Ligand binder design. Structure first.
Ligand SMILES: OC[C@H]1O[C@H](O)[C@H](O)[C@@H](O)[C@@H]1O
Ligand SMILES: OC[C@H]1O[C@H](O)[C@H](O)[C@@H](O)[C@@H]1O
Ligand SMILES: OC[C@H]1O[C@H](O)[C@H](O)[C@@H](O)[C@@H]1O
Ligand SMILES: OC[C@H]1O[C@H](O)[C@H](O)[C@@H](O)[C@@H]1O
Lengths: 487, 487
């Protein structure tokens, strides 16, 4: 029940929701339809839950990295702006909101973690991470602290782990090899071990967090923090003489902050799509609209060309956009949430002292690439799960005589970047039986949708190939038999 | 990973955590083991999440109403204080922390919403709710507001809905009929409709909240608020001439504030149980310990007899304890969280204006009497689930040849209040096959743990009976084969 006739927006708490609300009112003024902004807590996780139910906001705002998995689940409506309109925005921002050839959300503003310091407490910010353990005892001297940033969310500690070779999922020919996870490499271990030690040497504690670090900096207690545009508002009225700049380099390399494109996705459930499209296209993505929000909180380097040729003047923005370039754009693929988790754990677990970086990261690597996030804790959850499963198949037995192994495959395929997979992949993943695996690939082959599958080269591992129109029919079928459980 | 050798406590933010921390230090002094208190935000919901994972605090503090569902899930350790000790506390407080014959948490202090007003702005508090819409325009006159209390959490608006016949789950022969939900009755509709209108007539707005109302009162802007002992601290330094008293009566009946027993449950996962038990029994539940915290924030009518014979002197306490009596003790049963939800929704939805009390409550009644569970949304969740299941059995095939149907039963039994169940129960619940159901009961019977099962009276709906030592072995087995799915 999304309730027609109005817009409900979900935007994160550290952002211009009051500003966006202004946009929403100008809309109501002209349109006549009301818009109400809300900043649920943890809307990124809450969205897929309530949105799977067919409820939730009409529009959800968040970094483009979550939208891949949303669109995947079917939570997001496909946006179809004409070419003229797309021209008002930077080609690379649409790219971030493009998933499997479709545009899933509107890009709003580019975000990158900048380095912010207190010029009255250090008119000269260090340009490296190694020349800091020292700068801490010098400022720890006059009763202060060198650095203080959020150590709870891996979005902040990633730049350091990334800098020297840490990476999400290897990238190459336009695709991401979700199997190739770079978080347990030398470069990754390096930056983390450093962060770990910065703590061991009482320079900063494992429990620092956004709230803590933000005050600590705005109240002069710390010489510098690590944050983005949205945080400038507070520092502004906290009227401190601060500067935004390049993230210190590690082992010589710059910090590679994952970059996020704050985008607005329209709920697939929503019954107000034409309205949301009109709000975002005609109202929000206009100079007024964007500045309206920028006033409340900094959007950073907006995606809207026109207005960005104003924000660009600002050295803060140019600083953001500089850090941006040095970092990589966040993948929008579904396996991202799994990535963020693996990392969150690893960091917290090793900064605390429960694990040695090696451990934290070896587990982290495994977790980041695991195909499944196990949702079963109690045997009651087991029973719960078993009941659900058992029910599912029995209901689809007649029509769709698709057994588990089969369903598993079609799914593994649909959630795949590649149009060609090997019996090895599908075998390593899923404790399957060579007997059923093969019988299953066959079972689907015999069906005009599994597309060709054919003897490996090396042999003993048949390659599974799926067309483009093939992968289109596997989708239409899943969406079809997915009605038997989606409720 | 709970980390042995220390205590981590989770207590709600509006309470004596600094005071509790003092207790924790006296402990560390004598013991040598450290204790760190923390007030996560929304620990009541966050606990079951992180605690299901096998992580979380060693000790969790909260109103006894949540503990039923915690113990249910298996999150809570069973506390076994000797009789002599139990004598130091009021028999009724142990009753609140007793679930299915076991003691799940230590009772700490009784809590009830009192009525607090500003004597300098009204030395005479109204004694009814009807004689208030008026008292608002008289104080709204000299630039003030009559009432201002939290309208977001249904814990505050319940007293009014309860007063005239609103009730959670009907109670009678010592049991709660979770099917009999009294929130859509006449008495319920009445009090809500009143609250609704108090807003319509611009006496108070639908968005008031703890924060807002608390300042509004402490800053003299409002003549009275609705709150409990923990809020007296702020009003104290806010040095206002306030008084704590009886909640105005509605339609003639007193306000029935759900009463909560702040209890301390020990995490079932925790590896420090003997220590937590020692902390709570030997340190926290002593006169010093309790007053240490009472200083920080008022506990209200403590459960510890000795110290309560001091607090009882205070007219505030006697006011609390008076309101308490007029209200009912909150049920500790699992269906409580579902209750709190249904109500939260209904209230907010109808106070806002989105729904007419009728609607809000009819939905609320339905919701309060529902069950909830990870239902699987995506076929990817299906695959996810199937993989988990399939794996589980294969791992327990050798050691524990317990098939699904069997596991299902032992679980249904363990999560049962009764020590006797009928083939009907286990049959209606679980689309089971009469063939397997029976074969399964048999399979377990043949095992020395399913206890007796024997021909019904009525039909051949065989009655399943489990000892007391029987239900103890079914538990030890589940905990045993439950290691195969831990994460
Ligand atoms: O906590 C990390 C998050 O911080 C802010 O919300 C950023 O806008 C968002 O892109 C990022 O994902
Ligand atoms: O640090 C973890 C977080 O980083 C960024 O905020 C991502 O946008 C978000 O998805 C993730 O949870
Ligand atoms: O908001 C409701 C809560 O208020 C206070 O924290 C009470 O101590 C607690 O018993 C209750 O659950
Ligand atoms: O209003 C809802 C809340 O009411 C009381 O405070 C309960 O103790 C708490 O568990 C519940 O969530």
């Amino acid at each position: 029940k999304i309730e027609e006739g109005k817009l409900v927006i979900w935007i994160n708490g550290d952002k211009g929701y009051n500003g966006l609300a202004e946009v929403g009112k100008k809309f109501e003024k002209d349109t006549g339809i009301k818009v109400t902004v809300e900043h649920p807590d943890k809307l990124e996780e809450k969205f897929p839950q309530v949105a799977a139910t067919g409820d939730g906001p009409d529009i959800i705002f968040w970094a483009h990295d979550r939208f891949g998995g949303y669109a995947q689940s079917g939570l997001l409506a496909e946006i179809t702006p004409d070419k003229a309109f797309q021209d008002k925005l930077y080609p690379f921002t649409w790219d971030a909101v493009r998933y499997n050839g479709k545009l899933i959300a509107y890009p709003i503003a580019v975000e990158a973690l900048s380095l912010i310091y207190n010029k009255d407490l250090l008119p000269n910010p260090p340009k490296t991470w190694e020349e800091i353990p020292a700068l801490d005892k010098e400022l720890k001297a006059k009763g202060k602290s060198a650095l203080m940033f959020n150590l709870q969310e891996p979005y902040f500690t990633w730049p350091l782990i990334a800098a020297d070779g840490g990476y999400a999922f290897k990238y190459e020919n336009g695709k991401y090899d979700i199997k190739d996870v770079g978080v347990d490499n030398a470069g990754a271990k390096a930056g983390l071990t450093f962060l770990v030690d910065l703590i061991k040497n009482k320079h900063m504690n494992a429990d620092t967090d956004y709230s803590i670090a933000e005050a600590a900096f705005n109240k002069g207690e710390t010489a510098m923090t690590i944050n983005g545009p949205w945080a400038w508002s507070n520092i502004d009225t906290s009227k401190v003489n601060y500067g935004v700049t390049v993230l210190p380099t590690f082992k010589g390399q710059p910090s590679k902050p994952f970059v996020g494109v704050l985008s607005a996705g329209i709920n697939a459930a929503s019954p107000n799509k034409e309205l949301a499209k009109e709000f975002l296209e005609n109202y929000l993505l206009t100079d007024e609209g964007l500045e309206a929000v920028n006033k409340d909180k900094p959007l950073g380097a907006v995606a809207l060309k026109s207005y960005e040729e104003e924000l660009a003047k600002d050295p803060r923005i140019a600083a953001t956009m500089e850090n941006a370039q040095k970092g990589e754009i966040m993948p929008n693929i579904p396996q991202m949430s799994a990535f963020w988790y693996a990392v969150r754990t690893a960091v917290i677990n090793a900064a605390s002292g429960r694990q040695t970086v090696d451990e934290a990261l070896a587990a982290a690597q495994t977790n980041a690439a695991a195909e499944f996030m196990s949702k079963i804790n109690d045997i009651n959850d087991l029973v719960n799960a078993t009941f659900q499963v058992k029910k599912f198949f029995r209901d689809t037995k007649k029509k769709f005589n698709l057994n588990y192994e089969e369903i598993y495959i079609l799914n593994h395929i649909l959630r795949s970047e590649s149009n060609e997979i090997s019996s090895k992949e599908i075998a390593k993943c899923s404790e399957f039986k060579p007997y059923y695996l093969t019988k299953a690939l066959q079972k689907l082959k015999d069906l005009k949708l599994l597309s060709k599958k054919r003897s490996l080269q090396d042999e003993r591992t048949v390659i599974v190939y799926v067309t483009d129109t093939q992968k289109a029919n596997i989708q239409k079928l899943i969406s079809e038999l997915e009605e038997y459980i989606k409720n």
